[PDB]
Amino acid sequence: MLGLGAWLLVWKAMYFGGVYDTWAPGGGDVRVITNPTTNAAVIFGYLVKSP
Amino acid sequence: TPDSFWYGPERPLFLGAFTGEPPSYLTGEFPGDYGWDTAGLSADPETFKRYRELELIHARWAMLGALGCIFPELLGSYGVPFGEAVWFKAGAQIFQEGGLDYLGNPNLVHAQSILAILGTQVLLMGAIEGYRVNGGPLGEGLDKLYPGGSFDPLGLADDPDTFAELKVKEIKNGRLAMFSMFGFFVQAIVTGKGPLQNLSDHLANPGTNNAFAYATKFTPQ
């Protein structure tokens, strides 16, 4: 139920208009995320990083 | 035979619930009996014994082979200055000019002659495979494939239930390696790289570094 609930944010960012991306060029803007970074070495690098 | 979950009629089977009943000669008292002899190579009990030393020695070489092929390759990626870290390119280290320096260290073994390596391999491997058949100073009349005694120094195969349990672990760790050491051969003919170099590329992009990117490699041309 919260595995599926995580996908709603994923589907809304790749299909349903996207989300507000404040790193857009020339001020922040809503961008549809097309190429999500899914590399395990990139994703799991945050978890075992020092705080 | 006790209730040991691996020996006897309640043993697990190689297709799960869809197996039904094993063959009539695989009655479940030997290690790793999941009841898979569909082609029936071993219906003769004289012949069925002959595949079990044929399987277990293949296991006891492949488990050394699975660790042995990656462990110099793994340390080679962390700065140990090997000649070659890749297992199928490490045999040709005798032809380079520095000789086969063990661990990449010139003050170790420093082998030069490929004939001298092979000349002393046969004179030793003949004797100890000769001792494995019979005789030898470490035990005269013992089992052909669980000798024990001087080949179990730490004494951890004494209880007949634990020792019957660890035989199941030996063959399953073995059959994991023989299947995997078969994998090293095919994904070195196909991919041409070291086996962890195949692994570190599949972790890079799993959708595109799978085996289907090499599917059109052997097109008839």
Binding site: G45, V48, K49, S50 | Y78, G79
Partner: protein
């Protein structure tokens, strides 16, 4: 370069390891303490059972 350093505080290297000897130090100490625990598991009760915890 008046001196030599780690230069590794803002780098965000995983677990703080930068030399691969640290990974073997992280893992080799872990496997040894696991090995002593796994052997000594024979004394800690055998709860291979339907339900055998500190239940209530």
């Amino acid at each position: 370069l008046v001196d030599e350093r780690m230069n590794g505080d803002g780098t965000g290297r995983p677990f703080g390891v930068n030399d691969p000897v640290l990974g073997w130090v992280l893992l080799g100490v872990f496997g040894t303490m696991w090995a002593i625990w796994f052997i000594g598991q024979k004394d800690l009760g055998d709860f291979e059972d339907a339900d055998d915890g500190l239940k209530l």
